[PDB]
Amino acid sequence: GAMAQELKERAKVFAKPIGASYQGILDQLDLVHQAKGRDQIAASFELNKKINDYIAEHPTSGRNQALTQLKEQVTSALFIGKMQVAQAGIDAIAQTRPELAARIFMVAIEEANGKHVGLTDMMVRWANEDPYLAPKHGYKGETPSDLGFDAKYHVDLGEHYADFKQWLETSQSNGLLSKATLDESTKTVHLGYSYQELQDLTGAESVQMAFYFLKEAAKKADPISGDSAEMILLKKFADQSYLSQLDSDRMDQIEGIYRSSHETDIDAWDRRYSGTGYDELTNKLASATGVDEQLAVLLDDRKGLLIGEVHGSDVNGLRFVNEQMDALKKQGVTVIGLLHLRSDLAQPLIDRYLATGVMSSELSAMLKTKHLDVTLFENARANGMRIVALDANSSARPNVQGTEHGLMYRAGAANNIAVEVLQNLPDGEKFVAIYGKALLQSHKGIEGFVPGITHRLDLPALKVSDSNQFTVEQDDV
């Protein structure tokens, strides 16, 4: 009857039963209550994002007025005083990416106190223009705890499951791709390699095949947007921890680029290695005769050698380091650096080989993919020298998703690796590192400046010829 409905309605109006969506807001509120540091700021941006999403979906909900006010109080707390200076740019980002906004927010707090003026605007501009900082949903839902490894993706292979499985199992029986686990009931692979790491193993056909089917599954998950297979894998299948770690590291690298532009002594680099300094180094070099004396000039009051490699052949650097390893050793060199290999994926494999004398399948596949001579590693091990991988984790692609940010990111991250691995060897120990010529020079783009490897390590960029003649390459202005 109408009485029963009248009573039901009076009860409903007084104690509005809580939907799933409003429950999410209350849960998120508790997080604002309990969290500390940057977590509390992120939780506050995420509270706001939940409120906006709620009001959008329940336009005529009675709860909107009290949620709106809550949203303004939160916003007022966050952007009080000088923090309002960066508010418009940070809040616009917080609309889609609360954790990202919170990181920038912490930087803006410092900028309000007068640290690194300009960094905040730089981070905001990257967040808007770098395709890799765009909103990335990734894989949502429960992920297994069993895996002996950190999953980077959880990819539903659908129709490509059987092929992927075959080539994965062929790979695993040859010691490759061990950090991958199949769940047949959902046709998914839990995958412990990044897109870029896999690409570095495709000298092995079985990996190349597995990689091919992985990519097909990705393309089929998103046929409509123009996203590459790599970007699709992130936005649709990335583990959430992996996403955070990517976003975090990219923000770190932007700060790195910023600091390096102010703290690198480029004035002194140009005095030593341009103009008169260059003329003088070139003259002293040309008067020396043979490998021994050229080395002594190049390493005189310098921590190492930087040798350029050109796209195509000119593998003269790789050849030289191998054939003349003894002459390098006698001049104090104890470390050989290769931009050809990625530090995260390769260094554990390299180190285990130098310790045990046993080369893993995985390293053997990487060397093959990169066309590196196994004898370099044997000659290094026999000579007591360490080989170190110098590249970061992103695409070497001079084009990455259509902007300059991929280029700057790689140069930034490679600069950091170089400083950590090459810049402070024990007293007397020198290095020889081989870089592609693009990293040796500075990046002077409209979208930002990055010091060259040369600038960061206070060294000239070198070229070695078919007859072991060194020359100093002029700075790319």
mmCIF file of N, CA and C in Angstrom, residues 227-339:
data_model
loop_
_atom_site.group_PDB
_atom_site.id
_atom_site.type_symbol
_atom_site.label_atom_id
_atom_site.label_comp_id
_atom_site.label_asym_id
_atom_site.label_seq_id
_atom_site.Cartn_x
_atom_site.Cartn_y
_atom_site.Cartn_z
ATOM 1 N N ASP A 227 47.697 4.279 -30.429
ATOM 2 C CA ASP A 227 48.764 3.899 -29.507
ATOM 3 C C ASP A 227 49.606 2.729 -30.029
ATOM 4 N N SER A 228 50.922 2.848 -29.867
ATOM 5 C CA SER A 228 51.827 1.767 -30.217
ATOM 6 C C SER A 228 51.593 0.578 -29.291
ATOM 7 N N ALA A 229 52.103 -0.585 -29.684
ATOM 8 C CA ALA A 229 51.952 -1.780 -28.860
ATOM 9 C C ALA A 229 52.542 -1.543 -27.473
ATOM 10 N N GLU A 230 53.687 -0.866 -27.416
ATOM 11 C CA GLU A 230 54.320 -0.603 -26.127
ATOM 12 C C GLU A 230 53.423 0.241 -25.201
ATOM 13 N N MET A 231 52.809 1.285 -25.742
ATOM 14 C CA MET A 231 51.946 2.156 -24.947
ATOM 15 C C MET A 231 50.652 1.441 -24.538
ATOM 16 N N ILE A 232 50.107 0.634 -25.445
ATOM 17 C CA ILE A 232 48.929 -0.173 -25.136
ATOM 18 C C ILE A 232 49.228 -1.115 -23.962
ATOM 19 N N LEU A 233 50.392 -1.757 -23.993
ATOM 20 C CA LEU A 233 50.758 -2.686 -22.930
ATOM 21 C C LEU A 233 50.723 -1.986 -21.577
ATOM 22 N N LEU A 234 51.227 -0.748 -21.525
ATOM 23 C CA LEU A 234 51.180 0.024 -20.282
ATOM 24 C C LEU A 234 49.743 0.383 -19.864
ATOM 25 N N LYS A 235 48.992 1.014 -20.770
ATOM 26 C CA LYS A 235 47.693 1.587 -20.413
ATOM 27 C C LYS A 235 46.670 0.510 -20.086
ATOM 28 N N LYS A 236 46.852 -0.682 -20.647
ATOM 29 C CA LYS A 236 45.851 -1.722 -20.471
ATOM 30 C C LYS A 236 46.296 -2.861 -19.574
ATOM 31 N N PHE A 237 47.597 -3.137 -19.503
ATOM 32 C CA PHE A 237 48.054 -4.352 -18.827
ATOM 33 C C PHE A 237 49.145 -4.182 -17.751
ATOM 34 N N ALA A 238 49.673 -2.977 -17.586
ATOM 35 C CA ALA A 238 50.755 -2.781 -16.629
ATOM 36 C C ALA A 238 50.323 -3.059 -15.191
ATOM 37 N N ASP A 239 51.183 -3.746 -14.449
ATOM 38 C CA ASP A 239 51.002 -3.834 -13.013
ATOM 39 C C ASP A 239 51.023 -2.426 -12.407
ATOM 40 N N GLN A 240 50.158 -2.184 -11.419
ATOM 41 C CA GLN A 240 50.025 -0.865 -10.798
ATOM 42 C C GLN A 240 51.309 -0.411 -10.081
ATOM 43 N N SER A 241 52.016 -1.350 -9.447
ATOM 44 C CA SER A 241 53.304 -1.041 -8.822
ATOM 45 C C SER A 241 54.286 -0.564 -9.885
ATOM 46 N N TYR A 242 54.288 -1.257 -11.027
ATOM 47 C CA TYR A 242 55.189 -0.910 -12.127
ATOM 48 C C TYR A 242 54.890 0.502 -12.629
ATOM 49 N N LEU A 243 53.606 0.815 -12.808
ATOM 50 C CA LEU A 243 53.190 2.158 -13.216
ATOM 51 C C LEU A 243 53.705 3.236 -12.267
ATOM 52 N N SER A 244 53.464 3.057 -10.971
ATOM 53 C CA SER A 244 53.967 3.997 -9.970
ATOM 54 C C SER A 244 55.464 4.218 -10.107
ATOM 55 N N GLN A 245 56.201 3.120 -10.216
ATOM 56 C CA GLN A 245 57.654 3.168 -10.272
ATOM 57 C C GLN A 245 58.122 3.882 -11.551
ATOM 58 N N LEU A 246 57.395 3.700 -12.657
ATOM 59 C CA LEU A 246 57.697 4.439 -13.891
ATOM 60 C C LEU A 246 57.447 5.928 -13.728
ATOM 61 N N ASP A 247 56.257 6.286 -13.247
ATOM 62 C CA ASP A 247 55.940 7.688 -12.995
ATOM 63 C C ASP A 247 56.934 8.311 -12.015
ATOM 64 N N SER A 248 57.285 7.585 -10.955
ATOM 65 C CA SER A 248 58.174 8.137 -9.956
ATOM 66 C C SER A 248 59.519 8.415 -10.585
ATOM 67 N N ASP A 249 60.031 7.450 -11.342
ATOM 68 C CA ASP A 249 61.378 7.583 -11.879
ATOM 69 C C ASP A 249 61.440 8.692 -12.913
ATOM 70 N N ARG A 250 60.388 8.832 -13.711
ATOM 71 C CA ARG A 250 60.369 9.915 -14.691
ATOM 72 C C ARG A 250 60.395 11.294 -14.013
ATOM 73 N N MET A 251 59.641 11.453 -12.931
ATOM 74 C CA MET A 251 59.690 12.705 -12.175
ATOM 75 C C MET A 251 61.082 12.942 -11.579
ATOM 76 N N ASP A 252 61.701 11.885 -11.068
ATOM 77 C CA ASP A 252 63.068 11.975 -10.586
ATOM 78 C C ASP A 252 64.036 12.423 -11.671
ATOM 79 N N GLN A 253 63.874 11.867 -12.876
ATOM 80 C CA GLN A 253 64.797 12.182 -13.963
ATOM 81 C C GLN A 253 64.620 13.621 -14.433
ATOM 82 N N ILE A 254 63.396 14.136 -14.364
ATOM 83 C CA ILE A 254 63.159 15.526 -14.766
ATOM 84 C C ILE A 254 63.893 16.461 -13.810
ATOM 85 N N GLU A 255 63.817 16.153 -12.521
ATOM 86 C CA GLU A 255 64.536 16.910 -11.510
ATOM 87 C C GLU A 255 66.038 16.835 -11.739
ATOM 88 N N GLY A 256 66.509 15.642 -12.106
ATOM 89 C CA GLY A 256 67.902 15.441 -12.463
ATOM 90 C C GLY A 256 68.359 16.320 -13.617
ATOM 91 N N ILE A 257 67.543 16.376 -14.664
ATOM 92 C CA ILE A 257 67.860 17.198 -15.828
ATOM 93 C C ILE A 257 67.936 18.648 -15.396
ATOM 94 N N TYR A 258 66.966 19.055 -14.585
ATOM 95 C CA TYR A 258 66.924 20.419 -14.082
ATOM 96 C C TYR A 258 68.204 20.742 -13.316
ATOM 97 N N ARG A 259 68.562 19.895 -12.353
ATOM 98 C CA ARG A 259 69.735 20.200 -11.529
ATOM 99 C C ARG A 259 71.010 20.184 -12.358
ATOM 100 N N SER A 260 71.092 19.277 -13.327
ATOM 101 C CA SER A 260 72.324 19.144 -14.092
ATOM 102 C C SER A 260 72.553 20.375 -14.962
ATOM 103 N N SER A 261 71.477 21.027 -15.382
ATOM 104 C CA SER A 261 71.605 22.248 -16.167
ATOM 105 C C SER A 261 72.214 23.391 -15.355
ATOM 106 N N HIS A 262 72.040 23.360 -14.034
ATOM 107 C CA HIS A 262 72.563 24.421 -13.175
ATOM 108 C C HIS A 262 73.909 24.076 -12.558
ATOM 109 N N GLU A 263 74.155 22.795 -12.329
ATOM 110 C CA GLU A 263 75.293 22.381 -11.524
ATOM 111 C C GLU A 263 76.466 21.862 -12.352
ATOM 112 N N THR A 264 76.234 21.557 -13.626
ATOM 113 C CA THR A 264 77.318 21.124 -14.516
ATOM 114 C C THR A 264 78.162 22.324 -14.949
ATOM 115 N N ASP A 265 79.484 22.202 -14.856
ATOM 116 C CA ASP A 265 80.378 23.327 -15.128
ATOM 117 C C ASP A 265 80.715 23.428 -16.612
ATOM 118 N N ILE A 266 79.770 23.943 -17.379
ATOM 119 C CA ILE A 266 79.892 23.911 -18.819
ATOM 120 C C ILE A 266 80.887 24.975 -19.257
ATOM 121 N N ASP A 267 80.985 26.053 -18.479
ATOM 122 C CA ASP A 267 81.967 27.105 -18.762
ATOM 123 C C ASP A 267 83.368 26.514 -18.793
ATOM 124 N N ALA A 268 83.697 25.724 -17.777
ATOM 125 C CA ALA A 268 85.009 25.076 -17.730
ATOM 126 C C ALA A 268 85.156 24.025 -18.847
ATOM 127 N N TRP A 269 84.094 23.297 -19.170
ATOM 128 C CA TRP A 269 84.213 22.302 -20.235
ATOM 129 C C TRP A 269 84.582 22.974 -21.560
ATOM 130 N N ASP A 270 83.955 24.112 -21.850
ATOM 131 C CA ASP A 270 84.256 24.824 -23.093
ATOM 132 C C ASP A 270 85.672 25.437 -23.102
ATOM 133 N N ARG A 271 86.168 25.866 -21.939
ATOM 134 C CA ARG A 271 87.564 26.315 -21.827
ATOM 135 C C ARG A 271 88.567 25.192 -22.131
ATOM 136 N N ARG A 272 88.343 24.009 -21.548
ATOM 137 C CA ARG A 272 89.242 22.867 -21.719
ATOM 138 C C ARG A 272 89.146 22.249 -23.111
ATOM 139 N N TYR A 273 87.933 22.146 -23.654
ATOM 140 C CA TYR A 273 87.719 21.320 -24.846
ATOM 141 C C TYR A 273 87.152 22.032 -26.078
ATOM 142 N N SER A 274 87.062 23.358 -26.027
ATOM 143 C CA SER A 274 86.689 24.162 -27.195
ATOM 144 C C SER A 274 87.742 25.222 -27.428
ATOM 145 N N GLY A 275 87.756 25.777 -28.630
ATOM 146 C CA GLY A 275 88.671 26.853 -28.946
ATOM 147 C C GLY A 275 90.109 26.463 -28.678
ATOM 148 N N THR A 276 90.790 27.296 -27.900
ATOM 149 C CA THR A 276 92.211 27.129 -27.630
ATOM 150 C C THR A 276 92.517 25.803 -26.928
ATOM 151 N N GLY A 277 91.709 25.462 -25.935
ATOM 152 C CA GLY A 277 91.837 24.180 -25.273
ATOM 153 C C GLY A 277 91.800 23.019 -26.254
ATOM 154 N N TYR A 278 90.793 23.015 -27.128
ATOM 155 C CA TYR A 278 90.680 22.005 -28.184
ATOM 156 C C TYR A 278 91.909 21.988 -29.101
ATOM 157 N N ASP A 279 92.325 23.171 -29.545
ATOM 158 C CA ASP A 279 93.487 23.299 -30.428
ATOM 159 C C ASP A 279 94.699 22.661 -29.776
ATOM 160 N N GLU A 280 94.844 22.916 -28.484
ATOM 161 C CA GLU A 280 95.998 22.446 -27.744
ATOM 162 C C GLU A 280 95.926 20.946 -27.478
ATOM 163 N N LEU A 281 94.749 20.443 -27.125
ATOM 164 C CA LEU A 281 94.619 19.009 -26.911
ATOM 165 C C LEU A 281 94.878 18.279 -28.227
ATOM 166 N N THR A 282 94.335 18.804 -29.322
ATOM 167 C CA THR A 282 94.507 18.190 -30.638
ATOM 168 C C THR A 282 95.982 18.141 -31.043
ATOM 169 N N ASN A 283 96.700 19.234 -30.799
ATOM 170 C CA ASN A 283 98.120 19.293 -31.125
ATOM 171 C C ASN A 283 98.960 18.326 -30.303
ATOM 172 N N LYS A 284 98.714 18.265 -28.999
ATOM 173 C CA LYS A 284 99.457 17.346 -28.145
ATOM 174 C C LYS A 284 99.173 15.901 -28.546
ATOM 175 N N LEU A 285 97.937 15.653 -28.964
ATOM 176 C CA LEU A 285 97.519 14.327 -29.395
ATOM 177 C C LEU A 285 98.232 13.885 -30.672
ATOM 178 N N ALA A 286 98.285 14.778 -31.654
ATOM 179 C CA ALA A 286 98.836 14.455 -32.963
ATOM 180 C C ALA A 286 100.348 14.224 -32.927
ATOM 181 N N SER A 287 101.021 14.837 -31.958
ATOM 182 C CA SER A 287 102.467 14.687 -31.825
ATOM 183 C C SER A 287 102.841 13.346 -31.197
ATOM 184 N N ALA A 288 101.939 12.788 -30.396
ATOM 185 C CA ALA A 288 102.142 11.461 -29.819
ATOM 186 C C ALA A 288 102.117 10.410 -30.922
ATOM 187 N N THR A 289 102.857 9.323 -30.727
ATOM 188 C CA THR A 289 102.976 8.298 -31.759
ATOM 189 C C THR A 289 102.597 6.914 -31.259
ATOM 190 N N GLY A 290 101.541 6.342 -31.828
ATOM 191 C CA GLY A 290 101.147 4.986 -31.485
ATOM 192 C C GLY A 290 100.126 4.943 -30.366
ATOM 193 N N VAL A 291 99.565 3.760 -30.123
ATOM 194 C CA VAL A 291 98.500 3.597 -29.140
ATOM 195 C C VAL A 291 98.921 4.056 -27.742
ATOM 196 N N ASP A 292 100.072 3.579 -27.275
ATOM 197 C CA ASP A 292 100.552 3.887 -25.926
ATOM 198 C C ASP A 292 100.589 5.381 -25.605
ATOM 199 N N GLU A 293 101.208 6.164 -26.482
ATOM 200 C CA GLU A 293 101.405 7.584 -26.226
ATOM 201 C C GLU A 293 100.119 8.389 -26.381
ATOM 202 N N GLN A 294 99.267 7.981 -27.316
ATOM 203 C CA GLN A 294 97.973 8.637 -27.493
ATOM 204 C C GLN A 294 97.127 8.471 -26.237
ATOM 205 N N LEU A 295 97.119 7.253 -25.698
ATOM 206 C CA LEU A 295 96.389 6.963 -24.475
ATOM 207 C C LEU A 295 96.883 7.833 -23.325
ATOM 208 N N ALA A 296 98.202 7.899 -23.173
ATOM 209 C CA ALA A 296 98.810 8.684 -22.103
ATOM 210 C C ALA A 296 98.406 10.161 -22.167
ATOM 211 N N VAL A 297 98.240 10.689 -23.379
ATOM 212 C CA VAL A 297 97.756 12.058 -23.561
ATOM 213 C C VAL A 297 96.287 12.188 -23.168
ATOM 214 N N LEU A 298 95.481 11.246 -23.633
ATOM 215 C CA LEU A 298 94.052 11.320 -23.402
ATOM 216 C C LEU A 298 93.696 11.110 -21.930
ATOM 217 N N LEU A 299 94.474 10.288 -21.232
ATOM 218 C CA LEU A 299 94.187 9.956 -19.838
ATOM 219 C C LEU A 299 94.965 10.827 -18.854
ATOM 220 N N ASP A 300 95.819 11.696 -19.381
ATOM 221 C CA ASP A 300 96.591 12.614 -18.547
ATOM 222 C C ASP A 300 95.676 13.563 -17.770
ATOM 223 N N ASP A 301 95.571 13.365 -16.454
ATOM 224 C CA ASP A 301 94.720 14.201 -15.594
ATOM 225 C C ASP A 301 93.244 14.111 -16.041
ATOM 226 N N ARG A 302 92.835 12.922 -16.478
ATOM 227 C CA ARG A 302 91.444 12.651 -16.818
ATOM 228 C C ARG A 302 91.036 11.274 -16.307
ATOM 229 N N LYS A 303 89.767 11.147 -15.944
ATOM 230 C CA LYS A 303 89.277 9.960 -15.272
ATOM 231 C C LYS A 303 88.977 8.814 -16.264
ATOM 232 N N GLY A 304 88.889 9.130 -17.553
ATOM 233 C CA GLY A 304 88.528 8.112 -18.516
ATOM 234 C C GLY A 304 88.558 8.557 -19.963
ATOM 235 N N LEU A 305 88.150 7.642 -20.844
ATOM 236 C CA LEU A 305 88.001 7.892 -22.274
ATOM 237 C C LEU A 305 86.559 7.751 -22.718
ATOM 238 N N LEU A 306 86.100 8.663 -23.570
ATOM 239 C CA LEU A 306 84.776 8.552 -24.174
ATOM 240 C C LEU A 306 84.926 8.327 -25.666
ATOM 241 N N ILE A 307 84.521 7.154 -26.130
ATOM 242 C CA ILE A 307 84.615 6.862 -27.545
ATOM 243 C C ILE A 307 83.245 6.820 -28.211
ATOM 244 N N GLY A 308 83.103 7.563 -29.305
ATOM 245 C CA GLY A 308 81.851 7.615 -30.035
ATOM 246 C C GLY A 308 81.669 6.445 -30.983
ATOM 247 N N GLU A 309 80.415 6.058 -31.195
ATOM 248 C CA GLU A 309 80.073 5.053 -32.187
ATOM 249 C C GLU A 309 78.974 5.631 -33.050
ATOM 250 N N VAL A 310 79.137 5.488 -34.358
ATOM 251 C CA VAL A 310 78.194 6.009 -35.339
ATOM 252 C C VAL A 310 77.231 4.902 -35.760
ATOM 253 N N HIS A 311 75.974 5.268 -36.007
ATOM 254 C CA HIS A 311 74.989 4.328 -36.537
ATOM 255 C C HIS A 311 75.466 3.744 -37.862
ATOM 256 N N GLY A 312 75.237 2.449 -38.042
ATOM 257 C CA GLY A 312 75.758 1.735 -39.192
ATOM 258 C C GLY A 312 76.870 0.842 -38.699
ATOM 259 N N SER A 313 78.043 0.942 -39.309
ATOM 260 C CA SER A 313 79.204 0.293 -38.726
ATOM 261 C C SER A 313 79.948 1.270 -37.801
ATOM 262 N N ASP A 314 81.189 1.596 -38.155
ATOM 263 C CA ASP A 314 82.141 2.191 -37.214
ATOM 264 C C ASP A 314 82.004 1.512 -35.859
ATOM 265 N N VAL A 315 82.429 0.258 -35.801
ATOM 266 C CA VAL A 315 82.513 -0.452 -34.540
ATOM 267 C C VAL A 315 83.950 -0.391 -34.039
ATOM 268 N N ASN A 316 84.693 0.590 -34.550
ATOM 269 C CA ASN A 316 86.083 0.805 -34.181
ATOM 270 C C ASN A 316 86.316 0.919 -32.676
ATOM 271 N N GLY A 317 85.367 1.520 -31.965
ATOM 272 C CA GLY A 317 85.451 1.606 -30.514
ATOM 273 C C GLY A 317 85.403 0.237 -29.848
ATOM 274 N N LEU A 318 84.440 -0.580 -30.264
ATOM 275 C CA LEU A 318 84.300 -1.930 -29.726
ATOM 276 C C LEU A 318 85.518 -2.765 -30.077
ATOM 277 N N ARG A 319 85.950 -2.680 -31.330
ATOM 278 C CA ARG A 319 87.147 -3.393 -31.763
ATOM 279 C C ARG A 319 88.340 -2.972 -30.913
ATOM 280 N N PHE A 320 88.541 -1.661 -30.777
ATOM 281 C CA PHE A 320 89.717 -1.131 -30.080
ATOM 282 C C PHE A 320 89.793 -1.581 -28.620
ATOM 283 N N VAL A 321 88.689 -1.439 -27.898
ATOM 284 C CA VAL A 321 88.650 -1.811 -26.485
ATOM 285 C C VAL A 321 89.036 -3.275 -26.294
ATOM 286 N N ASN A 322 88.657 -4.107 -27.266
ATOM 287 C CA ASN A 322 88.943 -5.539 -27.239
ATOM 288 C C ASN A 322 90.392 -5.854 -27.601
ATOM 289 N N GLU A 323 90.828 -5.384 -28.768
ATOM 290 C CA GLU A 323 92.170 -5.668 -29.280
ATOM 291 C C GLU A 323 93.286 -4.999 -28.470
ATOM 292 N N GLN A 324 93.006 -3.812 -27.943
ATOM 293 C CA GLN A 324 94.006 -3.047 -27.199
ATOM 294 C C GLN A 324 93.742 -3.036 -25.702
ATOM 295 N N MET A 325 93.047 -4.056 -25.207
ATOM 296 C CA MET A 325 92.671 -4.092 -23.799
ATOM 297 C C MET A 325 93.892 -4.045 -22.879
ATOM 298 N N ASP A 326 94.989 -4.682 -23.293
ATOM 299 C CA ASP A 326 96.232 -4.700 -22.511
ATOM 300 C C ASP A 326 96.872 -3.318 -22.388
ATOM 301 N N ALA A 327 96.847 -2.554 -23.478
ATOM 302 C CA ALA A 327 97.389 -1.194 -23.470
ATOM 303 C C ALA A 327 96.533 -0.292 -22.592
ATOM 304 N N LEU A 328 95.238 -0.582 -22.539
ATOM 305 C CA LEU A 328 94.346 0.174 -21.679
ATOM 306 C C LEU A 328 94.653 -0.150 -20.221
ATOM 307 N N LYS A 329 94.808 -1.445 -19.940
ATOM 308 C CA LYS A 329 95.097 -1.922 -18.594
ATOM 309 C C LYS A 329 96.366 -1.285 -18.035
ATOM 310 N N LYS A 330 97.429 -1.280 -18.834
ATOM 311 C CA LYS A 330 98.705 -0.695 -18.421
ATOM 312 C C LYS A 330 98.598 0.799 -18.088
ATOM 313 N N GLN A 331 97.621 1.491 -18.669
ATOM 314 C CA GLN A 331 97.405 2.907 -18.364
ATOM 315 C C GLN A 331 96.380 3.121 -17.246
ATOM 316 N N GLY A 332 96.046 2.051 -16.527
ATOM 317 C CA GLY A 332 95.216 2.165 -15.342
ATOM 318 C C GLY A 332 93.730 1.925 -15.528
ATOM 319 N N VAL A 333 93.320 1.550 -16.734
ATOM 320 C CA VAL A 333 91.898 1.323 -17.006
ATOM 321 C C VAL A 333 91.438 0.026 -16.341
ATOM 322 N N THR A 334 90.341 0.078 -15.594
ATOM 323 C CA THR A 334 89.865 -1.123 -14.917
ATOM 324 C C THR A 334 88.401 -1.379 -15.213
ATOM 325 N N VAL A 335 87.806 -0.485 -15.994
ATOM 326 C CA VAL A 335 86.391 -0.547 -16.298
ATOM 327 C C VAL A 335 86.124 -0.225 -17.766
ATOM 328 N N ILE A 336 85.304 -1.064 -18.396
ATOM 329 C CA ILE A 336 84.853 -0.848 -19.764
ATOM 330 C C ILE A 336 83.340 -0.608 -19.804
ATOM 331 N N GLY A 337 82.921 0.520 -20.355
ATOM 332 C CA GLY A 337 81.506 0.839 -20.363
ATOM 333 C C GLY A 337 80.883 0.733 -21.744
ATOM 334 N N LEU A 338 79.697 0.136 -21.788
ATOM 335 C CA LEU A 338 78.989 -0.090 -23.041
ATOM 336 C C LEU A 338 77.598 0.522 -22.972
ATOM 337 N N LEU A 339 77.312 1.478 -23.849
ATOM 338 C CA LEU A 339 75.950 1.991 -23.961
ATOM 339 C C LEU A 339 75.058 0.914 -24.590
#
